[PDB]
Amino acid sequence: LMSLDTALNEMLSRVTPLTAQETLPLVQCFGRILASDVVSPLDVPGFDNSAMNGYAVRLADIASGQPLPVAGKSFAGQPYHGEWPAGTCIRIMTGAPVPEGCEAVVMQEQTEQMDNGVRFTAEVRSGQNIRRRGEDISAGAVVFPAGTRLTTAELPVIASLGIAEVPVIRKVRVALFSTGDELQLPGQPLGDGQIYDTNRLAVHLMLEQLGCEVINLGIIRDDPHALRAAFIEADSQADVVISSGGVSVGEADYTKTILEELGEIAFWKLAIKPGKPFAFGKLSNSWFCGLPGNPVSATLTFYQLVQPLLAKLSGNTASGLPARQRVRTASRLKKTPGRLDFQRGVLQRNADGELEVTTTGHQGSHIFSSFSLGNCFIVLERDRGNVEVGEWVEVEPFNALFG
Amino acid sequence: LMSLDTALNEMLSRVTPLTAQETLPLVQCFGRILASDVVSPLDVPGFDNSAMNGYAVRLADIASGQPLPVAGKSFAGQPYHGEWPAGTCIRIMTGAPVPEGCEAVVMQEQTEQMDNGVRFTAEVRSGQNIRRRGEDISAGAVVFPAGTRLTTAELPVIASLGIAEVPVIRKVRVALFSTGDELQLPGQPLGDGQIYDTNRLAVHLMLEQLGCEVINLGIIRDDPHALRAAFIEADSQADVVISSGGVSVGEADYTKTILEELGEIAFWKLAIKPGKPFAFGKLSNSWFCGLPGNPVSATLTFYQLVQPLLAKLSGNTASGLPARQRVRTASRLKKTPGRLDFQRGVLQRNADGELEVTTTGHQGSHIFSSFSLGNCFIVLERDRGNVEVGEWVEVEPFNALFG
Numbered sequence: 001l002m003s004l005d006t007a008l009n010e011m012l013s014r015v016t017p018l019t020a021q022e023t024l025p026l027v028q029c030f031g032r033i034l035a036s037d038v039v040s041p042l043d044v045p046g047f048d049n050s051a052m053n054g055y056a057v058r059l060a061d062i063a064s065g066q067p068l069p070v071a072g073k074s075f076a077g078q079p080y081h082g083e084w085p086a087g088t089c090i091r092i093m094t095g096a097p098v099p100e101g102c103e104a105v106v107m108q109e110q111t112e113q114m115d116n117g118v119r120f121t122a123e124v125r126s127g128q129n130i131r132r133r134g135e136d137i138s139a140g141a142v143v144f145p146a147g148t149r150l151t152t153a154e155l156p157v158i159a160s161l162g163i164a165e166v167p168v169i170r171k172v173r174v175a176l177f178s179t180g181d182e183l184q185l186p187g188q189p190l191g192d193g194q195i196y197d198t199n200r201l202a203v204h205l206m207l208e209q210l211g212c213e214v215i216n217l218g219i220i221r222d223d224p225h226a227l228r229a230a231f232i233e234a235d236s237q238a239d240v241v242i243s244s245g246g247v248s249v250g251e252a253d254y255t256k257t258i259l260e261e262l263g264e265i266a267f268w269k270l271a272i273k274p275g276k277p278f279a280f281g282k283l284s285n286s287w288f289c290g291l292p293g294n295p296v297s298a299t300l301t302f303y304q305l306v307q308p309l310l311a312k313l314s315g316n317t318a319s320g321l322p323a324r325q326r327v328r329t330a331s332r333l334k335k336t337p338g339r340l341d342f343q344r345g346v347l348q349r350n351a352d353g354e355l356e357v358t359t360t361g362h363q364g365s366h367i368f369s370s371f372s373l374g375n376c377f378i379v380l381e382r383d384r385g386n387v388e389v390g391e392w393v394e395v396e397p398f399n400a401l402f403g
Numbered sequence: 404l405m406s407l408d409t410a411l412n413e414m415l416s417r418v419t420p421l422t423a424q425e426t427l428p429l430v431q432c433f434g435r436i437l438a439s440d441v442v443s444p445l446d447v448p449g450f451d452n453s454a455m456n457g458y459a460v461r462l463a464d465i466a467s468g469q470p471l472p473v474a475g476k477s478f479a480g481q482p483y484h485g486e487w488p489a490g491t492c493i494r495i496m497t498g499a500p501v502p503e504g505c506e507a508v509v510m511q512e513q514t515e516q517m518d519n520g521v522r523f524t525a526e527v528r529s530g531q532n533i534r535r536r537g538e539d540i541s542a543g544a545v546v547f548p549a550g551t552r553l554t555t556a557e558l559p560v561i562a563s564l565g566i567a568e569v570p571v572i573r574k575v576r577v578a579l580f581s582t583g584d585e586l587q588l589p590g591q592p593l594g595d596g597q598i599y600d601t602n603r604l605a606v607h608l609m610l611e612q613l614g615c616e617v618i619n620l621g622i623i624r625d626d627p628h629a630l631r632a633a634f635i636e637a638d639s640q641a642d643v644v645i646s647s648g649g650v651s652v653g654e655a656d657y658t659k660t661i662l663e664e665l666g667e668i669a670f671w672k673l674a675i676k677p678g679k680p681f682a683f684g685k686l687s688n689s690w691f692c693g694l695p696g697n698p699v700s701a702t703l704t705f706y707q708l709v710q711p712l713l714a715k716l717s718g719n720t721a722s723g724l725p726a727r728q729r730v731r732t733a734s735r736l737k738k739t740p741g742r743l744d745f746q747r748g749v750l751q752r753n754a755d756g757e758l759e760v761t762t763t764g765h766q767g768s769h770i771f772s773s774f775s776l777g778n779c780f781i782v783l784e785r786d787r788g789n790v791e792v793g794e795w796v797e798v799e800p801f802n803a804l805f806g
Binding site: 026027030045046077078094095131136149151152153154155156157159160161162163164180181182184186187188190192193195196197198199201202204205206208209216295299323324325326349353354355366367368369371372374400401402403 | 429430433448449454478479480481482498500534539547552554555556557558559560562563564565566567585587588589590593596598599600601602604605607608609611612619698702726727728729752756757758767769770771772774775777803804805806
């Protein structure tokens with residue numbers, strides 16, 4: 001009934017990014033969000049230097065027009081020191097500091113080297129081939145704005161400025177648990193109607209790889225007191241509490257009333273597949289997300305809803321959701337109009353070098369193999385019907401959580 | 404002069420994956436490599452269950468052609484163990500264990516309920532709608548083979564079989580250090596032609612993010628005794644030793660002779676760009692990789708050479724190097740024939756939804772901003788010359804190390 005985009009946007013619009021900060025040495029900031037703007041203490045480059053391998057010259061010596069004998073050279077870490085007579089030029093390489101008085105650099109490929117001097121023939125604009133002090137970064141400028149996620153791309157740049165540590169928004173703390181007498185821990189046998197608890201592990205793993213602080217309270221006993229106690233504890237410790245299965249997502253029972261007793265929680269019916277139910281709302285001091293019991297739905301629902309939410313909450317300002325592309329199906333796809341189907345498929349290059357999706361197989365939610373076999377989602381539009389080999393189709397490549 | 408592909412195949416052919424293992428609880432196994440095959444101790448599904456929501460019947464009761472009353476119910480968590488008399492049927496839910504003496508299940512769709520029992524609208528064939536124990540995974544089967552890298556796709560499935568821990572290959576240990584009287588740590592001034600050391604950090608961050616155990620020995624003083632001592636230690640405590648800058652990559656000097664003295668190392672000149680020099684070879688108890696001093700070259704060289712080596716080393720059996728696709732340039736690219744140019748670009752969708760690359764800007768190695776601004780490499784062929792807007796071109800999306 002309710003659309004995914006509508007749901008997501010309503011979740012996101014209620015949420016306020018964290019602000020609490022901590023200062024850490026750069027090596028420990030991977031994945032972390034900047035709490036404050038990084039301001040450059042130095043100029044980059046720190047001095048005027050050559051854009052090219054060629055010769056440093058003065059605009060007047062060129063106008064004179066005689067070949068210019070080489071008076072010396074300026075290199076990597078050894079500027080040209082000493083006098084530079086009129087009627088001469090300085091040999092120079094990329095990155096090397098331009099000598100005092102220099103008005104241009106000429107690339108050697110535009111010149112004729114002879115025993116008695118370099119002959120210049122092309123026009124010589126002033127400033128050409130010269131990289132100005134701080135043209136790349138000026139001291140006092142903001143190199144990286146607050147809200148930036150720190151990666152190998154940013155952190156070395158910060159170190160290049162001589163900064164040892166930066167302040168970052170604190171990890172988001174997420175309490176995790178599941179409930180139900182069916183749920184079984186490993187090592188024990190499966191009594192009557194029991195199954196091993198897989199959703200919790202799945203969520204724990206994704207949470208940790210998303211940079212969060214997990215507080216796994218485990219399986220809570222089929223009991224209202226155990227459950228109220230779990231929520232109280234979870235909500236007091238964390239910014240987000242997750243039920244990975246067992247708490248109500250619509251159906252009326254002892255868990256649904258505790259939920260209605262502890263916060264304002266909405267029970268959604270998403271127009272997606274697989275999945276459908278989703279619980280979301282505010283507890284006393286936290287946000288609550290309750291997932292359906294089916295592994296495939298829990299994962300899907302987590303990945304496409306909780307994951308975005310956690311991002312916003314972290315302080316990250318990177319607007320947009322994982323990238324998608326248009327692609328031809330080498331496979332035939334069973335799709336029902338009514339729901340936004342996130343099928344699994346296999347994106348790979350064909351003989352022509354073009355990219356194409358193949359189904360992983362049976363798209364039913366009774367099996368989890370489609371996450372291993374796959375490598376992307378075939379995001380089939382809500383209103384769309386069956387898909388015939390060769391039709392245009394949306395793929396969302398899996399991110400690192402699945403490979 | 405020497406091709407990337409050739410160097411890569413030489414490095415990797417000499418290498419021998421680690422075997423040393425350790426058994427860890429599943430929640431600690433993300434990104435880790437399975438040391439032994441995961442063999443299934445149970446059948447999945449564990450019991451002959453129902454595919455649909457409907458009724459468990461027998462063919463002799465359907466044959467009587469009359470409405471058969473509901474003797475009881477069977478849910479997933481509440482298997483039926485009651486009476487099941489002759490002219491009756493059992494209401495069942497999807498995923499639920501089919502009651503003893505079953506033969507088929509029917510959906511509530513091909514069924515209308517009368518006051519005297521359930522009327523059967525359609526036909527009922529022997530074994531319809533019953534999932535049979537072990538049709539997805541048989542007990543004794545190999546679920547995941549040794550060398551598989553454990554992710555959110557695999558790890559929950561392993562918990563579904565009731566396994567708590569699995570054996571994984573030990574992390575690769577990687578020793579890191581740089582050298583030179585020019586390298587400066589943060590907080591200290593830049594003496595004459597001194598610079599802040601960024602390549603070490605860059606590498607540390609990537610190593611950690613690839614799952615390695617980093618031993619960062621910092622900046623070694625410009626002195627053969629400190630260098631020998633660092634090497635003797637790095638080699639004894641790790642599987643790979645990396646100079647991130649400062650050790651020879653060809654130029655003869657005190658560093659090069661300690662290198663030749665401590666193992667068999669080849670100094671290569673790669674036909675790639677940016678970069679070119681790379682040192683690789685065997686020390687006593689380890690593998691050595693020496694990177695060029697230029698930040699862009701050290702990163703690029705690490706990413707394209709050292710990364711695949713670590714992958715092989717780790718035990719991972721995932722044959723291949725990150726994916727590529729053919730794509731049009733919205734940007735003009737300056738390219739010289741002779742070297743394989745790993746330029747940086749911006750892969751994004753256009754108004755028609757198709758994918759396209761744009762340059763990040765200046766491709767020179769005097770700046771690092773191309774890794775942040777970018778999100779992919781434009782892998783321009785060795786023999787290739789300049790590229791015009793709309794030309795077909797190869798792109799290799801950045802992985803997680805760059806965001």
